């Protein structure tokens, strides 16, 4: 039988796990009023 | 009576405390009115936009 055969050359393998990031701002910092009152302008 | 005779500048300046000190008490109370005036005429309409209600 004519059997094509592969001899294993091994070593380097970059493994990268691609997987779903959910990006967010570095400082969100929602401006909440420290002090009550009508927003005048 | 300043410079002249009885008032003896410290006993004057003990009163010039009490004027400057109790006029400051007015500034406490006149603002304590202005606090409780903007809880009286502070009823309500509108919020300071002008438009269609």
From Swiss-Prot, chain B:
Domain of life: Bacteria
Disruption phenotype: Cannot grow on efflux substrates novobiocin or fusidic acid.
Subcellular location: Cell inner membrane
Family: Belongs to the membrane fusion protein (MFP) (TC 8.A.1) family.
Function, in words: AcrA-AcrB-AcrZ-TolC is a drug efflux protein complex with broad substrate specificity that uses the proton motive force to export substrates. This subunit may act as an adapter protein that links AcrB and TolC stably together. It is elongated in shape, being long enough to span the periplasm.
Subunit structure: Monomeric in solution. Homotrimeric; interacts independently with AcrB and TolC as well as AcrZ. Part of the AcrA-AcrB-TolC efflux pump. Complex assembly is independent of an efflux substrate and appears to be constitutive.
Protein name: Multidrug efflux pump subunit AcrA
Residues of the full protein shown: 132 to 184 of 397
């Amino acid at each position: 039988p004519a059997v094509g055969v592969v001899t294993v050359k091994t070593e380097p393998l970059q493994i990268t796990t691609e997987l779903p990031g959910r990006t967010s701002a570095y400082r969100i910092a929602e401006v909440r009023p420290q002090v009550s009152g009508i927003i005048l302008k | 009576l300043l410079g002249t005779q009885y008032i003896s500048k410290q006993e004057y300046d003990q009163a010039l405390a009490d004027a400057q000190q109790a006029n400051a008490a007015v500034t406490a109370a006149k603002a304590a009115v202005e606090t409780a005036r903007i809880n009286l005429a502070y009823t309500k309409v509108t919020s300071p936009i002008s438009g269609r209600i």
